[PDB]
């Protein structure tokens, strides 16, 4: 059992840039963080990053998300967001290696995009 | 959305046991502990109303359900486990899907 922290609410403007932090307790490690958007039917994988502690983030996603790692957190930035992209953005944190494998799901950050 | 009701305060027993009821079809109930902005899925149970609910791990939480509520019990609590314990009930199937997040049961564990 691990914990995941991310702010409850973030606002973005017409520039379409939103930033939030996904924080987790590392008891060790190789990390994968995935950002999920709560669509009415299912979750949508917005972006994913992997990295080893101390290294820069490797983004599988094609330039939708950028960010950095600072110990036990990742500082994410989403761009291209419009008003209808408003929703709950959940980051899934996987501590993959060395074992044991850990999975954490955050409460999600509500992103309100204005104009 | 949906309304979920749980008591504001609960004091754990001497043996480190605390009980509370979550008041709300295939249902998943998750107990979230909220320390700061951090969330921990302490335990999770899935059931269809009328069945003995099955926990995804049976070492922390026990419970039962009677119609419109979950009678949850958490064992092995120490003072460090004192905090806000959020009750999440999901009405998964049949549709539509409902996500109800309780206000949170503040569990105190003395000594």
């Amino acid at each position, epitope marked *: 059992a691990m914990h995941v922290a991310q702010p409850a609410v973030v606002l973005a403007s017409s520039r379409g840039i939103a930033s939030f932090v996904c924080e987790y307790a590392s008891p060790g490690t190789e990390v994968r963080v995935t950002v999920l958007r709560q669509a009415d039917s*299912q*979750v949508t994988e917005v972006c994913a990053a992997t990295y080893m502690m101390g290294n820069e983030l490797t983004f599988l996603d094609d330039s939708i998300c950028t960010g950095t790692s600072s110990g036990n957190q990742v500082n994410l930035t989403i761009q291209g967001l419009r008003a209808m992209d408003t929703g709950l953005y959940i980051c*899934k944190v996987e501590l993959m290696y060395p074992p044991p494998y850990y999975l954490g*799901i955050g409460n999600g950050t509500q992103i309100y995009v204005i104009d | 959305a949906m309304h979920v009701a749980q008591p504001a305060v609960v004091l754990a027993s001497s043996r480190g046991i605390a009980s509370f009821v979550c008041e709300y079809t295939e249902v998943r109930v998750t107990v979230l502990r909220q320390a700061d902005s951090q969330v921990t*899925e302490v335990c999770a149970a899935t059931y269809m109303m009328g*069945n003995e609910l099955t926990f*995804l*791990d049976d070492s922390i939480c026990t419970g039962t359900s009677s119609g419109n509520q979950v009678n949850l019990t958490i064992q092995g609590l120490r003072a460090m486990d004192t905090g806000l314990y959020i009750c999440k009930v999901e009405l*998964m199937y049949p549709p539509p899907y409902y996500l109800g997040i309780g206000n949170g049961t503040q569990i105190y564990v003395i000594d």
Partner: nanobody
Amino acid sequence: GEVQLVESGGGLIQPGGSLRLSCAVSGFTVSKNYMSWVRQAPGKGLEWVSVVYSGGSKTYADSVKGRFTISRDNSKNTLYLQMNSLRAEDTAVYYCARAVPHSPSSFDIWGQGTMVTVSS
């Protein structure tokens, strides 16, 4: 407690053929849990193919409805996916998981997967 989801029974098949994927489970009782079959087609995202809930009620994606049948055997503690009338659209990696499409859980466990290649 270590939980194991061991898949099997995939492979290559000609169009119109049938296949029966299995998912051998140890660590939880299958007949008293929810499970789902998920697949990823080449150059596509995760598609949730079928769900069974703890009581026994089942859902299917409309792109597999009437051909795919999700099943669980209480004696073998195994989850099955009977795939009939297979087409080239069903070529994917297939996973079982103690998970649900609606929202993720910290208790989601996934199988190691199995390749399904419908081709001729």
